[PDB]
């Protein structure tokens, strides 16, 4: 909470996002199963619309760019002013961005539809139309008079939730607060740390809910939506780094009913 | 009648040749532009992903015949031998292989080359894996002359014969004429085990091309005299595919009308 001011994004992007956490090569990585999952699932087709929200970006665009040609019109939010900054870096090829094309060249490769990843990343920054600040903590995450296209046909979002909260009934409230921001019939596809009890960014250490499958399953079920979809990626050894003590990543599916 | 004089102007004209300049020329944008399907780059790794493909060109030993400064060639092909030769004419061309095979950051960047060929192989292989790969089996650079009947010269480095030639843009970009062509078409062919095949990548009716100071004088030639060629050396051609180049591409660089590959296997 306060502990976010310390949050530093380019220790978060290191720690997650550089080798080894970040190794695209090895299919067996938690990269490539992270956007194995997002390409799998959108391009069932079943996943679409026109707008889009992703909740809590951090400083980070992978979860967005298997989507991004399923959505005209995608919103990117974060609680932090300086994710934002780091996200606008990016979007307009500004000085110090970070490099995401590995992660664009791979969503490519995973797609299989030919594309190149500057056709891709061209695309992504074209539809992202505006980055917001948010607050899940809030009944409305995104404000009162929100320049987001209200409802979303469908939500993002990775290592956000239980990552901002204490305990589970906050994980559960929280949930309930950004799916208020999905219309019905929405689609929602939810990316997060299993088992988790802090992760470190910088200066900041953060503290999280540990939760499980089932639980992420339960919640969900509770908030209202049909969970189409919830997989499991364990955590290797090689992979556990001294930046937090995650055991595993789910991946959740779930459509608003 | 004599080929001593054609040949002594094309080593004469490539003595100019500058490696930086024709890579600019014809593998930055726009005719390196990867990301346009209907471009010639991704037309030609095209080619040689789905040659490849089919599982039906495979062995031990490659060789890429006239190489130049250039590796796309061998993208596709590399997962398929485990000894690759690589060979040119000019020393600065070979020395400029040499500074990719190193890994220098002075050498010339492959890597969306790389990528693309990892695209369209479609095994989601990455890319730096394909450039280790092709750093392993590159077991030599070596001088040739395909005017010479040993083009790899006498008591060569290179395993012979090899069970695959690859050549791309080389043979009708020395050959004064249509004879010459010929000649150095049979002259390679003589490295290739009988039932080995080659794929064959060149220019269709180019009469010259630029490479900085140097204006080379190149036959042009069209896909039948190119057919007729390979069954004169003791090919069955297996497939031979035409690139017509576009307005847009046609840059002042060269003359260039199109493209062909050649999918040829020798006879025996
Ligand atoms: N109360 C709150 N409401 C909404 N987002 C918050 C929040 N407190 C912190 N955040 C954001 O939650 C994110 C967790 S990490 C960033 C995750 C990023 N989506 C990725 O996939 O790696 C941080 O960007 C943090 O700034
Ligand atoms: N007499 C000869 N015998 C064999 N190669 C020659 C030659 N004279 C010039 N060369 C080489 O023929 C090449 C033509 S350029 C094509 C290079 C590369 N294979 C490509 O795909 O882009 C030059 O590298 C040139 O140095
Ligand atoms: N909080 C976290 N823990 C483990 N892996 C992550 N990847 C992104 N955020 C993470
Ligand atoms: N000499 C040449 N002419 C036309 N296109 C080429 N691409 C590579 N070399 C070429």
Known sequence: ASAYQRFEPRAYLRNN?????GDLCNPNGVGPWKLRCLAQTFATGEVSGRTLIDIGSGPTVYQL???CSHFEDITMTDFLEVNRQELGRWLQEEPGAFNWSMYSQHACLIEG???CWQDKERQLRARVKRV????VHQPQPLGAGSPAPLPADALVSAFCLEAVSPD???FQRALDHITTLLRPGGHLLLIGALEESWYLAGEARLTVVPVSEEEVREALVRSGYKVRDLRT??????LQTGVDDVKGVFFAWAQKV
Do not use: V
């Not at 917001?132 to 607050?135: A, Q």
């Not at 990626?233 to 090689?238: D, F, G, K």
């Open 113 to 115: 539809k030919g594309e």
């Open 168 to 170: 589970l009934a906050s």
């Open 233 to 238: 990626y364990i955590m290797p050894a090689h």
């Open 65 to 67: 760019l298997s989507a």
């Open 132 to 135: 917001l600040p948010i607050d």
């Open 17 to 21: 996002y550089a080798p080894p956490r």
